[PDB]
Amino acid sequence: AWPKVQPEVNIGVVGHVDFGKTTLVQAITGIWTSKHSEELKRGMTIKLGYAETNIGVCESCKKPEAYVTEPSCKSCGSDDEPKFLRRISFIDAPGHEVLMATMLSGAALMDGAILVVAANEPFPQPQTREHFVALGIIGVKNLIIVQNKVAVVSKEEALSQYRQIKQFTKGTWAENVPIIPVSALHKINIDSLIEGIEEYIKTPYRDLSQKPVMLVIRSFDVNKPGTQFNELKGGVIGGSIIQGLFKVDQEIKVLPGLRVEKQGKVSYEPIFTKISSIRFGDEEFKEAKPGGLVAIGTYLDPSLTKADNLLGSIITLADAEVPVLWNIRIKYNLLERVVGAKEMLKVDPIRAKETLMLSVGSSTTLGIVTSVKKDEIEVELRRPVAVWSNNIRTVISRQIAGRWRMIGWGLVEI
Numbered sequence: 303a304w305p306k307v308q309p310e311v312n313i314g315v316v317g318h319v320d321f322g323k324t325t326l327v328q329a330i331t332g333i334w335t336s337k338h339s340e341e342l343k344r345g346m347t348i349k350l351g352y353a354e355t356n357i358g359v360c361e362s363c364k365k366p367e368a369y370v371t372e373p374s375c376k377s378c379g380s381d382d383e384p385k386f387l388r389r390i391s392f393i394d395a396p397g398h399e400v401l402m403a404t405m406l407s408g409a410a411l412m413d414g415a416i417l418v419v420a421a422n423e424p425f426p427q428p429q430t431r432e433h434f435v436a437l438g439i440i441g442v443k444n445l446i447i448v449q450n451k452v453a454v455v456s457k458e459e460a461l462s463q464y465r466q467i468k469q470f471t472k473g474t475w476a477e478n479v480p481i482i483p484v485s486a487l488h489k490i491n492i493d494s495l496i497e498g499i500e501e502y503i504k505t506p507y508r509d510l511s512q513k514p515v516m517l518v519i520r521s522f523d524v525n526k527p528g529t530q531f532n533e534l535k536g537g538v539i540g541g542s543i544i545q546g547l548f549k550v551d552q553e554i555k556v557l558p559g560l561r562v563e564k565q566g567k568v569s570y571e572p573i574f575t576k577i578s579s580i581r582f583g584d585e586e587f588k589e590a591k592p593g594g595l596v597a598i599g600t601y602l603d604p605s606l607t608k609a610d611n612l613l614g615s616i617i618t619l620a621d622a623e624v625p626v627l628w629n630i631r632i633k634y635n636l637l638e639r640v641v642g643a644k645e646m647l648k649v650d651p652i653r654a655k656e657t658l659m660l661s662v663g664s665s666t667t668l669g670i671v672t673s674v675k676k677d678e679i680e681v682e683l684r685r686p687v688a689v690w691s692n693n694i695r696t697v698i699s700r701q702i703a704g705r706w707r708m709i710g711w712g713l714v715e716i
């Protein structure tokens with residue numbers, strides 16, 4: 303008698319490369335997130351992976367084994383069904399070096415986070431530190447550190463690394479962050495991770511008063527090949543809602559929208575449409591709340607949505623007043639040292655005329671610095687950015703050693 307509702311919380315899974323993120327998400331949800339051919343062939347995550355599962359508890363059994371991801375208490379004794387707590391979803395971020403820009407985007411969609419640390423690898427490491435301080439910046443401080451691959455190391459070594467993690471987090475915003483030893487591959491001590499999720503990653507408060515805003519991270523064409531032009535389904539736009547709620551048959555718009563070429567001149571025109579369908583995985587719904595990753599059916603030509611073309615864009619109501627800016631002011635603060643790089647090196651102050659990478663919401667855009675002050679910089683963006691609210695958290699990256707590395711953050715001023 304478990305209800306078929308949408309996920310109510312987004313838990314991001316971040317960490318260094320090949321530490322077992324996707325295998326962990328599979329160990330919990332039973333689903334392999336990587337569905338693209340490229341990432342299945344290369345054996346990594348390239349685009350944000352998604353997977354969801356129900357969470358329940360057999361309140362007549364002993365925790366943490368009392369927790370289940372399916373409506374059955376046969377594994378603990380009683381034949382009655384467990385108490386449905388909530389449905390959760392995971393955002394599986396890539397742990398690769400040159401995919402940081404993706405992770406940041408995913409971080410805009412996270413309510414809580416899990417940081418995967420390999421027990422068979424030394425601590426700390428590049429993308430570990432980087433994703434850590436990134437989560438600190440974004441505001442995803444509902445964190446759980448997971449000691450994966452614990453089955454290949456002795457308890458002495460596991461505790462040895464544990465001490466190092468506690469030392470590392472000692473004196474930071476993550477000082478009291480829990481550390482849970484699991485084995486994603488062989489499914490060892492997963493129940494404790496479920497329990498930890500329920501304890502430390504609670505479902506946030508959603509103020510439905512705020513205007514409906516969705517951050518787009520994917521878009522595609524559900525039309526199977528050779529489909530005649532009369533049976534062509536509308537374009538589908540996928541992403542996460544950060545505030546408010548969307549309903550079917552609602553008038554919406556995509557910002558900045560569509561790139562337009564007029565004899566070499568480039569502009570951007572908002573994409574107006576109507577929600578034809580809303581789904582969360584295989585289940586279809588009439589509403590769409592924050593938490594989970596929603597597929598929004600539109601009346602758009604599939605040509606516009608094909609191949610994640612609307613990535614980074616946002617979706618609001620048609621009559622919403624939203625500034626789409628080519629130039630933005632940012633009240634910034636820089637990091638002290640470049641955390642992503644393998645070599646320890648400090649970060650130069652923002653130079654005029656310098657080109658930077660800005661992560662605003664789910665959008666990554668390059669821009670040239672036009673004004674430099676102690677607390678504020680002004681940037682001329684190569685492409686427009688939709689700024690739905692005031693004080694939007696942005697992430698500032700600079701190209702170092704040929705690769706874009708995070709150097710600091712800021713808030714978008716309007």
Ligand SMILES: Nc1nc2c(ncn2[C@@H]2O[C@H](COP(=O)(O)OP(=O)(O)CP(=O)(O)O)[C@@H](O)[C@H]2O)c(=O)[nH]1
Nearest residue numbers: 319320321322323324325346347397451485486487
């Ligand atoms: N022994 C052991 N091996 C594991 C565990 N988890 C993952 N692995 C191994 O790591 C390999 C890749 O793990 P994967 O889950 O893809 O790591 P990832 O971090 O998602 C890859 P990327 O960071 O590039 O997106 C797998 O072949 C698997 O054998 C674990 O808990 N124990």
Ligand SMILES: [Mg+2]
Nearest residue numbers: 323324346347
């Ligand atoms: Mg992966």
